[PDB]
Amino acid sequence: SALGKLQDVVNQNAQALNTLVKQLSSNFGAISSVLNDILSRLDPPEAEV
Amino acid sequence: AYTNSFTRGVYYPDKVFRSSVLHSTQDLFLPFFSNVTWFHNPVLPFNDGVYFASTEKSNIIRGWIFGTTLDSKTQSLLIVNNATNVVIKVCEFQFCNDPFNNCTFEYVSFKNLREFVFKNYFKIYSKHTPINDLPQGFSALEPLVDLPIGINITRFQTLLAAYYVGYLQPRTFLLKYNENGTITDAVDCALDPLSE
Amino acid sequence: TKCTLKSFTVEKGIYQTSNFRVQPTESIVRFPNITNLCPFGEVFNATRF
Amino acid sequence: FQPTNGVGYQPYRVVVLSFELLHAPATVCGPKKSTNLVKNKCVNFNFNGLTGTGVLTESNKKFLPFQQFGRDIADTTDAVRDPQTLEILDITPCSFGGVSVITPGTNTSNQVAVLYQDVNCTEVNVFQTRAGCLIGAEHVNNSYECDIPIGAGICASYQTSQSIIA
Ligand SMILES: *[C@@H]1O[C@H](CO)[C@@H](O)[C@H](O)[C@H]1NC(C)=O
Ligand SMILES: *[C@@H]1O[C@H](CO)[C@@H](O)[C@H](O)[C@H]1NC(C)=O
Ligand SMILES: *[C@@H]1O[C@H](CO)[C@@H](O)[C@H](O)[C@H]1NC(C)=O
Ligand SMILES: *[C@@H]1O[C@H](CO)[C@@H](O)[C@H](O)[C@H]1NC(C)=O
Ligand SMILES: *[C@@H]1O[C@H](CO)[C@@H](O)[C@H](O)[C@H]1NC(C)=O
Ligand SMILES: *[C@@H]1O[C@H](CO)[C@@H](O)[C@H](O)[C@H]1NC(C)=O
């Protein structure tokens, strides 16, 4: 437990990367979090929005 | 009569496979240390789910009955084991108050603990553990059947040892998948400060 | 390199220019062995109408 | 119904199909084509439910009898059970990565050497380093001061008719 400083740098960067990745599964107010899914389901004009 | 649902009532909520990771999922689970209604006959409600269990010896418990009006007016599912096979039907029967039409569906194929979970279309989970008064401890439930019958249910009953009736609630848990993908332990994420 | 630097001369070094990316050669589709067929043989090849 | 009539009075058998759709999950669905299985190529798979692009390879993971997918610590698809023959395949996204252009100054020579980052250097005189796939530079056994840094301890330089050494 003396090496907390280095452990802290490693842990902080790991958590940043994991949050960045898990942002992929959010809708932000759109229909579906998958791109091809909206391209197939919704018409191009709606898919644009 | 009542008893205390210590730790039981956990079922693999989906089909994915995870190894040695602590997953955190929100769904309808049976709250830990809850109140189970000790029985040894009548109808019961179907609020949002059931934790039907049993500590049987000579298969006194045979089957279930579901449905809204519980007789001829709507359809009413019926699972039965008549010592041959589990003859499932969905025929809108005219029922008898002491047992022991269009059919949109059919099918024909103390030391026993047959834990079961039912919910809505219709899903079932089960687990058949040897036992020897509800034993503490932990055991997950594998999903053995799904039925796309679209029936509307609000009540149920039992055909004809003792059984118990939980009631699921929408509570977040914390599951411990082991390395084989087997749930080995869970933590009710709202039970008490330590658990939060 | 000359184009990304906006220059006609580049001093010695190592610059990053583009993004190597393999392309998906062919699509594939998989579904369980189709069985449990409908009994149309009983509707059309029935003895008596 | 007499057999010597014309086709006008001749009997006809009629079957009428009524496709009813109520708000139910549509149990009566048709067949689904299932192409052959190809491995070890960046392909665009669509298994029974899920889609995506990858490189399918025979794995050794042991699912449970009813499980279908596998996921990573970051909630990403990693293994799929072949719904026809129950063999569990992995999923490795086919390689991408940056492209760097090692060069002495244009004031010296027009020769360069490319470095594809993080590839097995068989997916594109051709050196394979711990950094990537170096293309266009001789591999010396010597060791001099680092002129152009690359990574993992490799350094390249323009030396003796001359060329680029790493
Ligand atoms: C419900 O649970 C409490 C404690 O959790 C217990 O004291 C009580 O007897 C149980 N039954 C009823 C009807 O309250
Ligand atoms: C159970 O019920 C089904 C449906 O009525 C019937 O076909 C079967 O013979 C029954 N089994 C026995 C042992 O009576
Ligand atoms: C089922 O019945 C309840 C009332 O008992 C009603 O609110 C609900 O809409 C019904 N659902 C279906 C699918 O019939
Ligand atoms: C996991 O599965 C293997 C397969 O036989 C079994 O031997 C082992 O006991 C299981 N549990 C653990 C913790 O490895
Ligand atoms: C660099 O360019 C200048 C022209 O501006 C030239 O006189 C000089 O010799 C060049 N040096 C080298 C090392 O190429
Ligand atoms: C590159 O691919 C070949 C053939 O697939 C393989 O034999 C070799 O081991 C690979 N290189 C590395 C570093 O894995």
UniProtKB/Swiss-Prot annotation, chain B:
Q: Which residues are glycosylated?
A: N35, N82, N102, N152, N180
Report disulfide bridges, numbered on this chain.
Answer: C91-C103
Resulting phenotype, Q26H: In strain: Omicron/EG.5.1
Where is the BetaCoV S1-NTD domain positioned along the sequence?
Answer: 1-196
What's the impact of mutating A140V? In strain: 20A.EU1
Effect in UniProt of substituting D133G: In strain: Beta/B.1.351
Task: Tell me the segments the record calls region Putative superantigen.
Answer: 178-196
Q: How does it assemble?
A: Binds to host ACE2. RBD also interacts with the N-linked glycan on 'Asn-90' of ACE2. Cleavage of S generates a polybasic C-terminal sequence on S1 that binds to host Neuropilin-1 (NRP1) and Neuropilin-2 (NRP2) receptors. Interacts with host integrin alpha-5/beta-1 (ITGA5:ITGB1) and with ACE2 in complex with integrin alpha-5/beta-1 (ITGA5:ITGB1). May interact via cytoplasmic c-terminus with M protein. May interact (via N-terminus) with host bilirubin and biliverdin, thereby preventing antibody binding to the SARS-CoV-2 spike NTD via an allosteric mechanism.
| Role description | Attaches the virion to the cell membrane by interacting with host receptor, initiating the infection. The major receptor is host ACE2. When S2/S2' has been cleaved, binding to the receptor triggers direct fusion at the cell membrane. When S2/S2' has not been cleaved, binding to the receptor results in internalization of the virus by endocytosis using host TFRC and GRM2 and leading to fusion of the virion membrane with the host endosomal membrane. Alternatively, may use NRP1/NRP2 and integrin as entry receptors.
Q: What is this protein called?
A: Spike protein S1
Protein species of origin:
Severe acute respiratory syndrome coronavirus 2
Which gene name does the record give? S
Query: Which residues of the complete protein does this chain represent?
Result: 27 to 298 of 1273
Swiss-Prot record, chain C:
Q: What does changing R48K do?
A: In strain: Mu/B.1.621
From the Swiss-Prot or TrEMBL record, give the protein name.
Spike protein S1
Reported impact of G41D: In strain: Omicron/BA.1, Omicron/BA.2, Omicron/BA.2.12.1, Omicron/BA.4, Omicron/BA.5, Omicron/BQ.1.1
Disordered, as annotated region: 21-37
Summary of the function given for this chain in its UniProt record: Attaches the virion to the cell membrane by interacting with host receptor, initiating the infection. The major receptor is host ACE2. When S2/S2' has been cleaved, binding to the receptor triggers direct fusion at the cell membrane. When S2/S2' has not been cleaved, binding to the receptor results in internalization of the virus by endocytosis using host TFRC and GRM2 and leading to fusion of the virion membrane with the host endosomal membrane. Alternatively, may use NRP1/NRP2 and integrin as entry receptors.
Gene it is expressed from: S
Q: What is the effect of changing N33Q?
A: Reduced viral infectivity
**Source organism of this protein record:** Severe acute respiratory syndrome coronavirus 2
Positions glycosylated per UniProt? T25, S27, N33, N45
The record describes its quaternary structure and partners as: Binds to host ACE2. RBD also interacts with the N-linked glycan on 'Asn-90' of ACE2. Cleavage of S generates a polybasic C-terminal sequence on S1 that binds to host Neuropilin-1 (NRP1) and Neuropilin-2 (NRP2) receptors. Interacts with host integrin alpha-5/beta-1 (ITGA5:ITGB1) and with ACE2 in complex with integrin alpha-5/beta-1 (ITGA5:ITGB1). May interact via cytoplasmic c-terminus with M protein. May interact (via N-terminus) with host bilirubin and biliverdin, thereby preventing antibody binding to the SARS-CoV-2 spike NTD via an allosteric mechanism.
